[PDB]
XYZ file of C-alpha atoms in Angstrom:
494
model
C -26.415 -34.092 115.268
C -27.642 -30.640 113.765
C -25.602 -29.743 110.638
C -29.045 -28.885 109.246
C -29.425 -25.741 111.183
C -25.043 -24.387 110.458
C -25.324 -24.769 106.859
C -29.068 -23.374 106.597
C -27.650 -20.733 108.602
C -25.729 -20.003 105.463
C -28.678 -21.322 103.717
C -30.355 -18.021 105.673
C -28.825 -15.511 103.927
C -29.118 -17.014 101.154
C -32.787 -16.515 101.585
C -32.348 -13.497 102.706
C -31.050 -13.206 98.732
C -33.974 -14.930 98.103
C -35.497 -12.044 99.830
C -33.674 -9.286 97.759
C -35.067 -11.812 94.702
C -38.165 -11.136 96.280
C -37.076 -7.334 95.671
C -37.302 -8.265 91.924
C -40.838 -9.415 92.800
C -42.034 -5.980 93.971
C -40.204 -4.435 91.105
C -42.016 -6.643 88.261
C -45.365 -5.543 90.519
C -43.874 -1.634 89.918
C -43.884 -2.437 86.363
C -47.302 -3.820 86.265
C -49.168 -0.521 87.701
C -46.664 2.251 88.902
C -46.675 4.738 92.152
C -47.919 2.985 94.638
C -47.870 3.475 98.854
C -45.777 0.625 99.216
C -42.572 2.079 99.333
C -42.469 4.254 96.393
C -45.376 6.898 97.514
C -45.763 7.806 101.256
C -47.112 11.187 100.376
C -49.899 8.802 98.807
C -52.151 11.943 100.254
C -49.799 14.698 97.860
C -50.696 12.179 94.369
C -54.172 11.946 95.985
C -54.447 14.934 95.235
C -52.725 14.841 91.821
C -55.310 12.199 90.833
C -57.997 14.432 92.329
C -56.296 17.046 90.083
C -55.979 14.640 87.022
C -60.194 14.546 87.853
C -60.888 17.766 88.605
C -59.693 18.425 84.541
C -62.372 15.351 84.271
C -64.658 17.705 85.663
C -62.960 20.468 83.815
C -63.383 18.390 80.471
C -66.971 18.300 81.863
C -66.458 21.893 82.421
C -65.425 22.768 78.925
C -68.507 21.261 77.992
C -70.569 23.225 80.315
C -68.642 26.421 79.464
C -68.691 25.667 75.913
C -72.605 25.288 76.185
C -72.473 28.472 77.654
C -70.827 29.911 74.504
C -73.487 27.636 72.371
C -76.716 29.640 74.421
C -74.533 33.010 73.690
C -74.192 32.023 69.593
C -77.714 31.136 69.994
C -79.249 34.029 71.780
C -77.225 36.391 70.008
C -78.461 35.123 66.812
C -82.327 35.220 67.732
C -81.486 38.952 68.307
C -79.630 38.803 65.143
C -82.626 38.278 63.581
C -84.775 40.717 65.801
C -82.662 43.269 64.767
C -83.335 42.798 61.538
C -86.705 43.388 61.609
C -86.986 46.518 63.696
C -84.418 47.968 61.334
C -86.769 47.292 58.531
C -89.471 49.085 61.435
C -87.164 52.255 61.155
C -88.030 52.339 57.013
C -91.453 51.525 57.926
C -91.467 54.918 60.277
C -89.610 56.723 57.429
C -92.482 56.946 55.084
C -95.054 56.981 57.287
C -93.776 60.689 57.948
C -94.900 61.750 53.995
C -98.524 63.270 53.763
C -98.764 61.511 50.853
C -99.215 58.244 51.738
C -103.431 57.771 52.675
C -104.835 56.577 55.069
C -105.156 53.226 53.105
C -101.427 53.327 52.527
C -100.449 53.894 56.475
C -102.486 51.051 56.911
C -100.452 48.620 54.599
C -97.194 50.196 56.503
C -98.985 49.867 59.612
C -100.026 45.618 58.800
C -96.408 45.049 57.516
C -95.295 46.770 60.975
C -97.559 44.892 63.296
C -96.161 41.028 61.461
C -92.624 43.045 62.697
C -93.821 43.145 66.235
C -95.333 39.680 66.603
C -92.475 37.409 64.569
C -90.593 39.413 67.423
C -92.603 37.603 70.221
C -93.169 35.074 68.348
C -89.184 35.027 69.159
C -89.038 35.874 71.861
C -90.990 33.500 73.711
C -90.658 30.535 71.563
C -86.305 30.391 70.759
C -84.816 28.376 73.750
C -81.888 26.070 74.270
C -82.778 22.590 75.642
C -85.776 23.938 77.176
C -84.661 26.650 78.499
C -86.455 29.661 76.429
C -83.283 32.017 76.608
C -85.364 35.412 75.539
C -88.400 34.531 77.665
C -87.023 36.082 80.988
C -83.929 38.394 82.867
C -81.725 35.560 84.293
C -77.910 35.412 85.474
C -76.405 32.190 84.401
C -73.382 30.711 86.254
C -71.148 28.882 84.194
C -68.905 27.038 86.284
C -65.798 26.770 85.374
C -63.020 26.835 88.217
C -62.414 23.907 90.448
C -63.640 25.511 93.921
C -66.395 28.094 94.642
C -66.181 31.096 93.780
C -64.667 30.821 90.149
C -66.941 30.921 87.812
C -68.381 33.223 84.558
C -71.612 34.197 84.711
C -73.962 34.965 81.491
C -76.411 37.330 81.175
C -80.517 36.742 79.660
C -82.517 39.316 79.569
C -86.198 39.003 77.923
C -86.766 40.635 74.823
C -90.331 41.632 73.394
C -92.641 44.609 72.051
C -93.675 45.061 75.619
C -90.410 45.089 77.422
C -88.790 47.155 74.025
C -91.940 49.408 74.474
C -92.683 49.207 70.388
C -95.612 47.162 71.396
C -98.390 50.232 70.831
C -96.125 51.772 67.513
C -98.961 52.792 65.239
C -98.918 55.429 62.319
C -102.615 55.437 61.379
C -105.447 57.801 61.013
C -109.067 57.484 61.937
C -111.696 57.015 59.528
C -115.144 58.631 59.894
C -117.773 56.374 60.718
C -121.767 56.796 59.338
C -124.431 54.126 59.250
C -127.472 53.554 57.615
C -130.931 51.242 58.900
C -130.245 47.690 57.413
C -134.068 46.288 57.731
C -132.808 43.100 57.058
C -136.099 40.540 56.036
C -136.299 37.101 57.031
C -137.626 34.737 59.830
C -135.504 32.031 62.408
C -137.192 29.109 64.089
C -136.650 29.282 67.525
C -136.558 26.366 70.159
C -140.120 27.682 71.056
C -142.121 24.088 71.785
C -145.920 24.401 69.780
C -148.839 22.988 72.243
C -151.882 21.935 69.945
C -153.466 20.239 72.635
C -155.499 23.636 73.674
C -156.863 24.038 69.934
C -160.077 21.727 70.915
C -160.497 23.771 73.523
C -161.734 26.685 72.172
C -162.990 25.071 68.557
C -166.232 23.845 69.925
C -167.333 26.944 68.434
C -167.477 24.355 65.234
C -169.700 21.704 67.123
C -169.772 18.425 65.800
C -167.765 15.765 67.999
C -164.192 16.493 67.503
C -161.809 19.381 65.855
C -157.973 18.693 65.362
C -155.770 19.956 62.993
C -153.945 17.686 61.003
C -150.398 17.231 61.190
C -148.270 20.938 60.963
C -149.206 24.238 61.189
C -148.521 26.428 58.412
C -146.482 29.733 59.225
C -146.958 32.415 57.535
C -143.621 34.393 56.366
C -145.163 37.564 55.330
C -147.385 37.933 58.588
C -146.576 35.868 61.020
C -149.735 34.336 61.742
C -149.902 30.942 61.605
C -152.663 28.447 59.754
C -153.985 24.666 59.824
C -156.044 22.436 58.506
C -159.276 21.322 60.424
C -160.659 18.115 59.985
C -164.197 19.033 62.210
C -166.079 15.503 62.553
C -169.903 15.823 61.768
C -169.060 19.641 61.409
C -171.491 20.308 58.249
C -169.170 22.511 56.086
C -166.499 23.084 58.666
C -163.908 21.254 57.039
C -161.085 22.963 55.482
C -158.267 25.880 56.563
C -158.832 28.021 59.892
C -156.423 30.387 60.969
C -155.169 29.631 64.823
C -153.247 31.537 67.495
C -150.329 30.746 69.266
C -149.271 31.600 73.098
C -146.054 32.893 71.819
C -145.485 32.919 75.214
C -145.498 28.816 75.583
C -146.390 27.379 72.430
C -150.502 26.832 73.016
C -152.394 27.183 69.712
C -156.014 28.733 69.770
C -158.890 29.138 67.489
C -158.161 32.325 65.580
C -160.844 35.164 65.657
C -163.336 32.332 66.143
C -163.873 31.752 62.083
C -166.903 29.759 62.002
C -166.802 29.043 58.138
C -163.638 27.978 56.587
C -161.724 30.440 54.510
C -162.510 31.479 50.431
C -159.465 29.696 49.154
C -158.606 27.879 51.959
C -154.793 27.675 52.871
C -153.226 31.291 51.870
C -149.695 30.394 49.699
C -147.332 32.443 51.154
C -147.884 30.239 54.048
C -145.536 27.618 53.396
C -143.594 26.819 56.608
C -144.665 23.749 58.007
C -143.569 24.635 61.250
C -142.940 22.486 64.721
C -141.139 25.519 66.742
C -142.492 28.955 66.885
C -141.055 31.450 63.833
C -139.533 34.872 65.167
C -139.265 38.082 63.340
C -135.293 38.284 63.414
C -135.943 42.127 63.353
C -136.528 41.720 67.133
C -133.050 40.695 67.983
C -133.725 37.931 70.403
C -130.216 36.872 70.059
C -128.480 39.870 69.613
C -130.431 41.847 72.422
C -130.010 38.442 74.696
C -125.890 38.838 74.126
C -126.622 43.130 75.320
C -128.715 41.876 77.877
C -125.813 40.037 79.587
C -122.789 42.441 79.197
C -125.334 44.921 80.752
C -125.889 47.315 77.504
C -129.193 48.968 78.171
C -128.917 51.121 75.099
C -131.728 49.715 72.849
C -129.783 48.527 69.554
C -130.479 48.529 65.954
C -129.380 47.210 62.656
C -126.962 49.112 60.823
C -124.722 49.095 57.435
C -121.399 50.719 58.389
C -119.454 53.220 55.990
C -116.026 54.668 56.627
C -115.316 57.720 55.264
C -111.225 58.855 54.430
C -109.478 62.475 54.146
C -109.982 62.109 50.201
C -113.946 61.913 51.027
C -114.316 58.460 49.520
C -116.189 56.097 51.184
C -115.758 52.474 51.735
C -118.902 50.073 52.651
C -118.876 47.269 55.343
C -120.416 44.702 56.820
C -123.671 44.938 59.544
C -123.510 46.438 63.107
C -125.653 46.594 65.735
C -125.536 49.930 67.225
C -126.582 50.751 70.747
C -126.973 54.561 70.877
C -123.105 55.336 69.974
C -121.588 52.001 70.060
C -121.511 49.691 67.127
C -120.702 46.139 67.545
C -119.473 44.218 64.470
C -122.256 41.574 63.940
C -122.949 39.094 60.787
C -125.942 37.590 59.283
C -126.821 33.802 59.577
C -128.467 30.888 56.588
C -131.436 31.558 57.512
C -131.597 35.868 58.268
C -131.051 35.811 61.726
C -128.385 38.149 62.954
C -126.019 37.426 65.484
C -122.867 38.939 67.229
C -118.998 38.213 66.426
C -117.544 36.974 69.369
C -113.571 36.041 70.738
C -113.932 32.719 72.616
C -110.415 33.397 74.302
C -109.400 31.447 77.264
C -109.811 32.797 80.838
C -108.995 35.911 82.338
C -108.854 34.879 86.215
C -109.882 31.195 85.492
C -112.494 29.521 84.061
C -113.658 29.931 79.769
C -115.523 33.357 79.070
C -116.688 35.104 76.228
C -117.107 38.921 75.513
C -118.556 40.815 72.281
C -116.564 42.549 69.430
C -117.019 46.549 69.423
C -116.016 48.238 66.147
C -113.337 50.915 66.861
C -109.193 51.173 67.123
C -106.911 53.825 65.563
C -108.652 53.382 62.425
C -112.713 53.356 63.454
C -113.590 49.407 62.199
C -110.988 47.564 64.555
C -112.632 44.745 66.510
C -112.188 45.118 70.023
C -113.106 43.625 72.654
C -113.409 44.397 76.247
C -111.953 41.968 78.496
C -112.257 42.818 82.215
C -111.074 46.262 82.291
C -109.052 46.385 79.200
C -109.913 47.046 75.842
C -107.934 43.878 73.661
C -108.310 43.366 69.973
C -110.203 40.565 68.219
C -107.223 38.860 67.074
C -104.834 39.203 70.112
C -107.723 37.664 72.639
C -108.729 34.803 69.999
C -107.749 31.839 72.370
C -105.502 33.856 74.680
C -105.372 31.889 77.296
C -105.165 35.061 79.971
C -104.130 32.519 83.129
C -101.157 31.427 81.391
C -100.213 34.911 79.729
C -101.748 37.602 81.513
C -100.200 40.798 80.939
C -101.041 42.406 77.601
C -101.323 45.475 76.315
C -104.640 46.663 74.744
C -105.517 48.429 71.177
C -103.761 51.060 70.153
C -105.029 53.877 69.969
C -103.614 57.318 69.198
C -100.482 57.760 66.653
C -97.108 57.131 68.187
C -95.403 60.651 68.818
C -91.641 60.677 67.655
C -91.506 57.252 66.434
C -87.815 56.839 65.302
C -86.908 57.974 69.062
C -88.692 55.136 70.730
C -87.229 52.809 68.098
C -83.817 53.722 68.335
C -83.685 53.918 71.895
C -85.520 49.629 71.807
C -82.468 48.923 69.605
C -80.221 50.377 72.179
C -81.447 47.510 74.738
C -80.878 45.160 72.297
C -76.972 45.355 71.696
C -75.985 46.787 75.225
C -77.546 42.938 76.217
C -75.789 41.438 73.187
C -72.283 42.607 73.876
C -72.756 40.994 77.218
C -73.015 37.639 75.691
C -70.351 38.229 73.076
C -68.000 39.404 75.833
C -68.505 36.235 77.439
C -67.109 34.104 74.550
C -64.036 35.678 74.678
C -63.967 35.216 78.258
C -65.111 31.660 78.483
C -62.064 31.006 75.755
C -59.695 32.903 77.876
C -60.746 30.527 80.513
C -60.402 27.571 78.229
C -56.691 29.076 76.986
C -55.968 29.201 80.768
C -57.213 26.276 81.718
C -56.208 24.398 78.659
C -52.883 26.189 79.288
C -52.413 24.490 83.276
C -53.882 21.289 81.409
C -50.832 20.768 79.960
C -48.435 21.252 82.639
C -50.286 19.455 84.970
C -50.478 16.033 82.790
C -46.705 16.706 82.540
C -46.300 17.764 86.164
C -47.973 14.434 87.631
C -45.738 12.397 85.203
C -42.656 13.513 86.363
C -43.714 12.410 90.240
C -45.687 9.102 88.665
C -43.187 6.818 88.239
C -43.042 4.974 85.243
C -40.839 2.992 82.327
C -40.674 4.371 78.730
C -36.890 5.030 78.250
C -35.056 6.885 80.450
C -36.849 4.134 83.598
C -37.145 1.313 81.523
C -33.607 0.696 80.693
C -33.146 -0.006 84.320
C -36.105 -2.232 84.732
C -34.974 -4.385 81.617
C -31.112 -4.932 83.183
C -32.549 -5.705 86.493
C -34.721 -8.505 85.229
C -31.444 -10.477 83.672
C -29.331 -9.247 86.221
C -31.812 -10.423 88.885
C -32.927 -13.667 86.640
C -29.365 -14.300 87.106
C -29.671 -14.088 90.199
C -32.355 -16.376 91.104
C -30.523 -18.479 88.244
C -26.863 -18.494 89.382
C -27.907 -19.035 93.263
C -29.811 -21.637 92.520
C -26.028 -23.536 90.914
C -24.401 -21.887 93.779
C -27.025 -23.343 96.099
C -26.285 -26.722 94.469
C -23.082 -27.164 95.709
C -22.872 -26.836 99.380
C -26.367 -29.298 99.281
C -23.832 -31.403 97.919
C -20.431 -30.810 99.994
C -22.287 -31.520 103.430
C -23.054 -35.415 102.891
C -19.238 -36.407 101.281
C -18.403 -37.280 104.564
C -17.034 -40.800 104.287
């Protein structure tokens, strides 16, 4: 018999109930996550997309950030300038006064230092303000800010590189010439040199002594006053040959050689003055090894000389300076040493088309006593080559040298440049917050948009949810009696 399989049959649909309470199932899963593309979402592509949406505001958020930076580099830049401005408005005074024949030489001079700190705290600006790195006044550059989802949308900044070069202020001078004179500094004093003194040859020409051997004991006395040098002689079995002799030196190598042949020692011996115990040869600084050496290499053939400069002014007073050696016409600003000798100023900048070189500082400039300095073809000033490295930063400008003609022109026009560029970036913020109003506008609607199609309980949804879990629980609940009772029925046959 197979009463199993009739009443199951029954049974069946009961399952099949048990299938609907299986519904239930896949509803408490709804209520657990949401849209799903089990049933709910076949267009699971269309809330791809929303999703993709939901993260391209991620991006966007990402965006804002980016955008925002954006605004950040145009505060930023616009506030270097800012500053810039500043002080080439405080140039315009500057160029004010400077136009009242009053003022001195002298006093163009202070206008023109206080002017020339204007120019370089500019570069120094310039070159050196930057936002994470990137130096935004140190070069012309277009930045895209992205800010749209696809290609194609985005707001671009502008950089443009400000300086005295590119503003053309960097040659604005307002200064006069002096008159240059010099007089012959015969400067007195001696240098040691690295000049090596051979002894060994004195013997050599001291048997003019006789006896068995002459040698002078240990240093040779130089003579500051004539150069020649002196020793003692300690002639073995020389009757009456002991005592000061006057010897010669090879100034060519050092060798030292009996003096004039002096048979008898000198009345009084060792002359005073000659006090330098010397071990290298003594040269008469008034030759100029050094200095001449320096000429020598630049290729200066003018013979040069020791000279006192003095600059004279439009009021005919006369300020003193320091020494210069002057070659003909040129006068190169030189300095004494400890001991008298006189040597060169020099730059020690850093390359000019790679490796370390030196060059010599000239006196000249717009005002006469400016150090230049000539560095390949171009004539730079002391203080703009010292440790320039000319690889790294090559184009420059050289020395000025004749006054600026119409002054406030050129300045107003540098300004010009200035807040045409600024506008730029100022325009930008407005239209990176327009972008952030739209944007931040769509954000809105979209979060809203995708939560009307997401579905999901908060009142409206979960009211339904909550009666279906009794209702259903009753279901599961009240089969299960009504499930009981046909179990039951089928075995009261008796």
């Amino acid at each position: 018999a197979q009463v199993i399989n009739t009443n199951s049959l029954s049974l069946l649909t009961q399952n099949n109930l048990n299938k609907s309470q299986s519904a239930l199932g896949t509803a408490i899963e709804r209520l657990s996550s949401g849209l799903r593309i089990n049933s709910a979402k076949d267009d699971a592509a269309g809330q791809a997309i929303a999703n993709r949406f939901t993260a391209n505001i991620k991006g966007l958020t990402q965006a804002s950030r980016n955008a925002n930076d954006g605004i950040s580099i145009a505060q930023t830049t616009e506030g270097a300038l800012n500053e810039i401005n500043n002080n080439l408005q405080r140039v315009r005074e500057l160029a004010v006064q400077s136009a009242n024949s009053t003022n001195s030489q002298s006093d163009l001079d202070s206008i023109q230092a206080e002017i020339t700190q204007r120019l370089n705290e500019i570069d120094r600006v310039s070159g050196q303000t930057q936002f994470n790195g990137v130096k935004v006044l140190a070069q012309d550059n277009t930045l895209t800010i992205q800010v749209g989802a696809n290609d194609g949308e985005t707001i671009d900044i502008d950089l443009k590189q400000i300086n005295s070069q590119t503003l053309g202020l960097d040659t604005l001078n307002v200064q006069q010439k002096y008159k240059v004179s010099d007089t012959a500094a015969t400067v007195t004093g001696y240098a040691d040199t690295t000049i090596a003194l051979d002894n060994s040859t004195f013997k050599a020409s001291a048997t003019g002594l006789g006896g068995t051997d002459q040698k002078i004991d240990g240093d040779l006395k130089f003579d500051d006053t004539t150069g020649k040098y002196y020793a003692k002689v300690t002639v073995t079995g020389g009757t009456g040959k002991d005592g000061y002799y006057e010897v010669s030196v090879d100034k060519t190598n050092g060798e030292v050689t009996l003096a004039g042949g002096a048979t008898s020692p000198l009345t009084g011996g060792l002359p005073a003055t000659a006090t330098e115990d010397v071990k290298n040869v003594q040269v008469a600084n008034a030759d100029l090894t050094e200095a001449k050496a320096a000429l020598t290499a630049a290729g200066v053939t003018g013979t040069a000389s020791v000279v006192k400069m003095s600059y004279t002014d439009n009021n005919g007073k006369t300020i003193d300076g320091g020494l210069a050696v002057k070659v003909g016409d040129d006068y190169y600003s030189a300095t004494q040493n400890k001991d008298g000798s006189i040597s060169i100023n020099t730059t020690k900048y850093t390359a000019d088309d790679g490796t370390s070189k030196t060059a010599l500082n000239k006196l000249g400039g717009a005002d006469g006593k400016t150090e230049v300095v000539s560095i390949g073809g171009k004539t730079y000033a002391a203080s703009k080559a010292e440790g320039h490295n000319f690889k790294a930063q090559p184009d420059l400008a050289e020395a000025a040298a004749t006054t600026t003609e119409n002054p406030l022109q050129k300045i107003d026009a540098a300004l010009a440049q200035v807040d045409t560029l600024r506008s730029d970036l100022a325009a930008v913020q407005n239209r990176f917050n327009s972008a952030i109003t739209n944007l931040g506008n769509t954000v809105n609607n979209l979060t809203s948009a995708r939560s009307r199609i997401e579905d999901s309980d908060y009142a409206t949804e979960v009211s339904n949810m909550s009666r279906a879990q009794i209702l259903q629980q009753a279901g599961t609940s009240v089969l299960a009696q009504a499930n009981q009772v046909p179990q039951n029925v089928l075995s009261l046959l008796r």
